[PDB]
Every structure is written in C-alpha cells, then in structure tokens.
Amino acid sequence: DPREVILCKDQDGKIGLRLKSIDNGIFVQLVQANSPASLVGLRFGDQVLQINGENCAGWSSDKAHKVLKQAFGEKITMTIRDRPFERTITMHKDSTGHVGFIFKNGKITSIVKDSSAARNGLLTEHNICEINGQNVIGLKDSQIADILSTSGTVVTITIMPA
Amino acid sequence: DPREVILCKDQDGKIGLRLKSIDNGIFVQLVQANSPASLVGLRFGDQVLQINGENCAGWSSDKAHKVLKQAFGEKITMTIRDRPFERTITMHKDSTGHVGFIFKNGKITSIVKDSSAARNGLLTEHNICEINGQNVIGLKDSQIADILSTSGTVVTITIMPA
Numbered sequence: 549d550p551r552e553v554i555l556c557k558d559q560d561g562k563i564g565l566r567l568k569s570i571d572n573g574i575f576v577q578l579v580q581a582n583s584p585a586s587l588v589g590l591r592f593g594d595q596v597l598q599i600n601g602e603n604c605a606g607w608s609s610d611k612a613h614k615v616l617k618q619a620f621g622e623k624i625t626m627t628i629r630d631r632p633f634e635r636t637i638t639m640h641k642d643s644t645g646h647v648g649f650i651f652k653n654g655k656i657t658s659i660v661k662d663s664s665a666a667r668n669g670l671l672t673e674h675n676i677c678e679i680n681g682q683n684v685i686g687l688k689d690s691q692i693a694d695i696l697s698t699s700g701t702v703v704t705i706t707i708m709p710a
Numbered sequence: 711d712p713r714e715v716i717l718c719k720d721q722d723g724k725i726g727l728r729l730k731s732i733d734n735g736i737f738v739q740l741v742q743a744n745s746p747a748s749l750v751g752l753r754f755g756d757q758v759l760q761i762n763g764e765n766c767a768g769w770s771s772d773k774a775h776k777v778l779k780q781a782f783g784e785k786i787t788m789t790i791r792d793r794p795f796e797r798t799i800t801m802h803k804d805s806t807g808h809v810g811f812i813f814k815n816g817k818i819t820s821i822v823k824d825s826s827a828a829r830n831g832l833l834t835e836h837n838i839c840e841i842n843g844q845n846v847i848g849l850k851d852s853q854i855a856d857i858l859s860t861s862g863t864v865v866t867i868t869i870m871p872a
C-alpha cells in the first residue's frame with residue numbers, strides 16, 4: 549500500500565531529490581546521501597502519488613520540481629508507493645568469479661551465454677539499483693565493478709526498467 | 711521462484727502460444743484458449759527461462775518458436791517465472807461510475823484529472839491483464855468496458871508495461 553512521509557528542507561533549501569516524469573507519473577531518480585530524503589527512507593524508484601495533498605499524475609519533471617521549490621513551510625508532505633518496479637534476483641559466481649552480464653552507465657546491456665544470469669533470466673535495459681543491499685545509483689561503472697569484484701559467490705541485485 | 715511445466719502438442723501440432731523476445735528474454739505474448747498452454751496455467755506475461763533444459767536468454771522470437779516447432783517428441787518441458795511485471799491497483803468509482811482512465815487495444819492511454827486512477831498513480835503504456843480476477847487479455851475494448859460497467863464500486867486491476 550502507499551504511505552505518507554514528512555520531511556524538512558535543509559540549509560540550502562532543498563531535500564536532495566530528483567524527480568522524473570515517467571508515463572504520466574512522478575518517480576524518484578536520485579536520493580542524495582545524508583539528506584532529508586535519505587532519513588525518511590526515500591530511494592531511487594519510489595513513485596510519488598501526492599505532494600502536499602495534490603496528485604502528481606500528469607506533472608512534468610519541471611512542474612514537479614517547481615512545486616517543491618515554491619512549497620511553502622518548513623515541512624513538505626508526500627504520499628509514496630515503494631519501488632513498484634522492483635525485481636530482486638540472486639545469482640552465483642562461476643570459477644572465473646563472474647555471474648555473466650555486461651553493463652554501461654549502470655544499465656545491463658547484454659547477458660553472457662550459459663551464465664548464472666542467463667540461467668535466472670536477467671533482462672537488458674534494466675538499471676542496477678542495489679548489490680547485496682549496497683545502493684549503486686549515481687556511481688561510476690568502475691565503482692560498480694569494484695563492488696561486484698569484492699562480493700562473495702552469492703550476488704543479489706535489485707533492478708528496474710530503464 | 712520459478713517452476714517447471716510439462717505439456718503435450720495438440721492434434722494440429724502446436725501448443726497455442728506466442729513468444730516475444732523482450733530485453734534478451736522470452737515472454738508469453740498470447741495463450742490461445744483451451745490449449746495445452748492454457749492447461750498447466752500459462753498466461754500472457756510469463757517469462758520463459760528454459761525450453762527443454764536450454765536457456766532462452768538471448769533468443770529471438772523466431773529462434774524461440776523454431777525450437778518448439780521442431781521440438782522432439784510428445785512432451786515439452788519449460789521453466790517459467792510467473793508474471794514478474796505484475797502490478798495490482800485498487801480504485802473506486804465516482805458518482806458517474808468511473809475510476810478515470812482511457813484505453814485503446816486494452817492499453818491505458820490517458821488518466822483523468824483528479825480521479826481515483828490519478829489518486830492511486832496509475833500509469834499509461836500499461837496493458838490491462840485482469841479486472842477483479844477476470845482475465846481480459848485478447849478481448850475487444852467493448853468487452854472490457856462491459857466488465858468495467860458490470861463491476862461494483864471497487865475496481866481492482868492488474869497491469870504490465872506494454
């Protein structure tokens with residue numbers, strides 16, 4: 549089900565959040581670390597239903613950001629649906645220490661034949677969100693590879709359509 | 711998470727199934743009624759992981775259909791993941807008996823302002839799969855409207871990206 553969240557604006561007068569209009573709906577594109585957004589448990593992928601009571605259905609990215617910018621008081625209220633496009637998939641590394649997919653800009657671009665990823669039916673055109681609980685949104689590809697490399701045999705990732 | 715299914719080829723030498731390659735993965739596009747696919751509970755949206763042991767990752771629509779066509783013997787085995795893109799949303803009709811969205815060819819094309827659909831954050835470019843348990847895949851728009859009309863106030867629908 550959805551849920552309500554109350555959060556306050558920081559010194560610089562922001563919440564550390566980017567919103568994207570996708571199919572006439574507003575979605576969290578990035579949540580900056582240690583921000584008011586972070587504390588109340590907002591994460592990349594969350595759907596924004598209302599902002600201060602008003603429905604977001606139909607709003608552009610620009611409209612959604614302009615509402616928050618001129619939003620009145622200390623406290624903004626938001627009705628959220630938790631990552632509705634969330635898919636978790638558990639994979640196992642082979643002898644070479646690989647689960648078997650290629651990615652660019654944190655998005656899966658190809659699957660390796662007869663790998664663990666192929667076995668479990670991983671899909672391309674999906675962004676990597678987490679790896680074993682560690683959020684990888686807004687990291688460089690090399691930083692993602694480090695996390696993959698420093699993982700154990702069991703590799704659980706969370707994905708979403710691009 | 712996944713599961714195995716065994717099914718036999720019918721008199722006309724088919725299973726009554728269409729498969730579509732989506733993001734280097736095979737998916738059920740349509741399940742013809744009273745077919746071997748229908749028995750054993752295949753439905754539009756299911757992901758095909760293996761066909762007769764072999765991983766489907768990377769296969770084209772043509773490749774996937776060609777495997778089944780020349781597949782040896784009475785019995786085909788398939789590893790399936792049940793509708794992984796499934797999203798349910800419950801809505802309530804207004805005074806005019808409307809939840810507030812437009813659709814064409816069983817796909818949501820627009821949301822009505824300040825409706826129940828807007829309130830609950832329904833998205834366009836999503837196919838309607840069920841309505842209160844009733845499957846509406848392969849129905850005409852008018853037949854869908856009948857089911858909507860003959861629904862009560864509470865309207866639960868299942869959707870998927872187009």
Ligand SMILES: CC(C)[C@@H](C(=O)N[C@@H](C)C(=O)O)N1Cc2ccccc2C1=O
Pocket residue numbers: 645646647648649650651652689690693696
């Ligand atoms: C094996 C390589 C090609 C692959 C990889 O580490 N694969 C993982 C998912 C596995 O199988 O453990 N990487 C690492 C990397 C770093 C920077 C930019 C792109 C990539 C990429 O595709």
Ligand SMILES: CC(C)[C@@H](C(=O)N[C@@H](C)C(=O)O)N1Cc2ccccc2C1=O
Pocket residue numbers: 807808809810811812813814851852855858
């Ligand atoms: C309000 C009307 C135009 C709408 C509708 O009854 N939808 C409900 C779910 C609502 O608006 O709540 N319909 C009915 C129909 C029949 C055949 C083809 C398209 C449509 C369509 O968009």
